[PDB]
Amino acid sequence: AVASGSGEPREEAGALGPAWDESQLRSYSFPTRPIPRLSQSDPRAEELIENEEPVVLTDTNLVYPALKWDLEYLQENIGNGDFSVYSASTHKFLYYDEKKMANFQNFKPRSNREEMKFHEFVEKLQDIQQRGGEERLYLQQTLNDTVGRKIVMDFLGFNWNWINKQQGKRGWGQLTSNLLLIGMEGNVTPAHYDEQQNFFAQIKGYKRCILFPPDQFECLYPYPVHHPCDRQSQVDFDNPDYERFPNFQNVVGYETVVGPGDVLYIPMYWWHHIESLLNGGITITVNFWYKGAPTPKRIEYPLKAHQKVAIMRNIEKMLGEALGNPQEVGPLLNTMIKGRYN
């Protein structure tokens, strides 16, 4: 009952029909409660953000000027700088960090990155659609200098007044980046966490977002810190291995479906699983990543979950450095705990 997931699908204005329907959602093995959908003026929303809990804001106008963006408009105005585009023979686009590939030679990426011009991206899509292909593409490109003047106009129209005040109220560091995400229906980014505070602005299409608090670290089994898939869950949500990952049986999520105009606050360290609804067409999103606030005066107990995750990360990093080889980290940790702490 309380695990109502994304809830009853919203009705679009002027009787244009249900935004989406249950059958566009993938099927998973865990329960989920709904993320609150609130007005930016609702003091409850300010409460959730201040407390680093997720909330969907329905009326920020954060990216009002971008709501007009489609492929046509963007190809026309975005410039001809390079755009990273990932390809995969599967619906899953597992993130990997290429700077860490050097030290796991045995890692072979499922998806491949290719730089290209926007028009080329648009062509590949049309090409795949008209030939019924099963290939999938996901453009994921940070918003840089080579963008056209109209796109820059839109950018300036963003609700900087609102977000700059959020940045200020939360003591967050600088805006590190804005990622532009354009994906095909059915695309999935497997569960992971980021060490950035994130306002995730939905623009075109609908995305189902499933989040897990940092205190579910134990149920989600991140890769080793030195692995390319650092911060990504090892668990295949489509075929969970309960032998390797027993506690995934205890995992409980928070979920919501976002559409044009919604902004989802994804607090730093919160796991998130993001998928573009089945048969919902392409999706477009722009995120806003901010460095988190500085670590307070000195430590205050009890520690929050995210501080414990930070401590584990640091242990793993320092051990890799001390041993002189990230590959020796596991054996040493085992030696340390077997028959001693387990």
Ligand X SMILES: O=C(O)c1ccnc(C(=O)O)c1
Does the annotation flag 232 for ligand binding?
Answer: yes
The structure tokens 């679009």 sit at 12
Binding partner of residue 245 among ligand X, Fe ion, a second copy, none, CB cut-off 5 to 8 Å per kind: a second copy
Q: Write the interaction track for ligand X spanning residues 147-186; mark x where CB under 6 A is met and - where it is not.
A: --------------------------------x-x-----
Tell me the closest approach of the beta carbon of residue 179 to ligand X, in angstroms.
Answer: 6
- Report which of 12, 8, 34 is spatially closest to residue 21, judged by C-alpha positions: 8
Decide whether 117 or 317 has the Cβ nearer to a second copy.
317
Does the annotation flag 314 for ligand binding?
Answer: yes
Looking only at residues 254 through 293 of this chain, which bind ligand X when binding is defined by CB under 6 A? 274, 285, 287
Task: List the alpha helices (DSSP H) in the chain.
Answer: 43-50, 71-77, 118-130, 149-156, 160-169, 217-220, 305-323, 329-337
The count of residues interacting with ligand X (CB under 6 A) is 10
Residue 183 burial (10 A CB sphere; 0-12, 13-18, 19+): buried
Decide whether 118 or 270 has the Cβ nearer to ligand X.
270
Q: Write the interaction track for a second copy spanning residues 267-286; mark x where CB under 8 A is met and - where it is not.
A: --------------------
Q: Could you say whether residue 194 binds Fe ion (CB under 5 A)?
A: yes
Inter-residue contact 53 to 174 (CB < 8 Å): no
Q: Give the Cα separation of 274 and 5 in Å (integer).
A: 14
Q: Give the Cα separation of 229 and 221 in Å (integer).
A: 11
User: What three-state secondary structure class fits 96?
Assistant: coil
Phi, psi of 190 (to 5 degrees): -55, 150
Q: Could you say whether residue 327 binds a second copy (CB under 8 A)?
A: no
Tell me the closest approach of the beta carbon of residue 69 to Fe ion, in angstroms.
Answer: 21
Q: In sequence order, what E strands does 215-276 have?
A: 253-258, 263-266, 271-276
Strands 197-204 and 179-183: unpaired
Q: Give the Cα separation of 72 and 76 in Å (integer).
A: 6
Which one among 3, 153, 252, 323 touches a second copy, defined by CB under 8 A?
A: 323
The structure tokens 């990622």 sit at 179
Looking only at residues 189 through 228 of this chain, which bind ligand X when binding is defined by CB under 6 A? 189, 194, 198, 200, 207
Tell me the closest approach of the beta carbon of residue 189 to Fe ion, in angstroms.
Answer: 7
**Angle (CA) 122 191 311, round 5°:** 130
Which one among 183, 222, 280, 320 touches a second copy, defined by CB under 8 A?
A: 222
Q: Give the Cα separation of 69 and 85 in Å (integer).
A: 18
Residues in the annotated binding site = 138, 145, 174-176, 189, 192, 194-196, 198, 207, 231-232, 272, 287, 293, 314
For Fe ion, the binding residues (CB under 5 A) are 194
Residues in the annotated binding site for substrate = 145, 174-176, 194-196, 231-232, 293, 314
For a second copy, the binding residues (CB under 8 A) are 217-218, 221-224, 234, 244-247, 299, 301-303, 308, 311-312, 315-316, 319, 322-324, 329-330, 332-342
